[PDB]
Amino acid sequence: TRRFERDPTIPPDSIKVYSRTLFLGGITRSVREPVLRSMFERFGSVQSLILNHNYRHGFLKMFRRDAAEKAQVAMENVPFADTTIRTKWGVGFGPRECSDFSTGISVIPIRLLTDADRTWLVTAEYGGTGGLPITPGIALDEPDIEIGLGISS
Ligand SMILES: [Cl-]
Ligand code: NA
Numbered sequence: 001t002r003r004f005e006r007d008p009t010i011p012p013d014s015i016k017v018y019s020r021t022l023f024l025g026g027i028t029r030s031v032r033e034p035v036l037r038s039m040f041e042r043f044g045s046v047q048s049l050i051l052n053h054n055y056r057h058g059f060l061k062m063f064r065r066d067a068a069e070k071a072q073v074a075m076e077n078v079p080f081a082d083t084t085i086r087t088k089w090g091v092g093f094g095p096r097e098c099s100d101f102s103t104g105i106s107v108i109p110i111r112l113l114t115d116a117d118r119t120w121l122v123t124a125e126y127g128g129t130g131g132l133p134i135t136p137g138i139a140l141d142e143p144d145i146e147i148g149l150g151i152s153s
């Protein structure tokens with residue numbers, strides 16, 4: 001079910017966004033996408049998994065925030081081959097400075113949302129407002145991003 005919570009105790013003129021994105025550290029070339037995908041599918045459905053071995057990292061997005069929380073706890077520090085897979089909260093939406101890297105929760109002043117950010121929030125298939133306007137004092141899950149700005153599809 002979509003998160004759309006009244007969260008009136010957060011700071012004025014802001015929204016709270018729960019990340020669905022996990023940062024993956026320790027990603028040596030012995031750590032491959034099909035294997036990580038199978039590991040994370042235990043916790044829920046995986047929406048995106050992109051490894052960049054050039055940087056020894058990857059980014060995972062779960063369809064559901066609750067699945068991301070379960071995955072982050074279970075996969076926080078996993079010995080594997082020549083490395084240790086280290087799963088931490090990432091940020092996939094909004095200003096990076098607004099994201100608490102300890103918890104994967106952003107509190108974002110509405111004034112810092114770009115027009116693309118605003119549009120993605122209200123039109124996202126997963127996360128976001130579920131088609132409602134952005135107003136202060138609401139908590140939401142990370143929306144899907146990086147698609148065209150449109151309301152016809
Ligand atoms: Cl799921
Ligand atoms: Na590393």
Ligand code: NA
Pocket residue numbers: 025086
């Ligand atoms: Na570390």
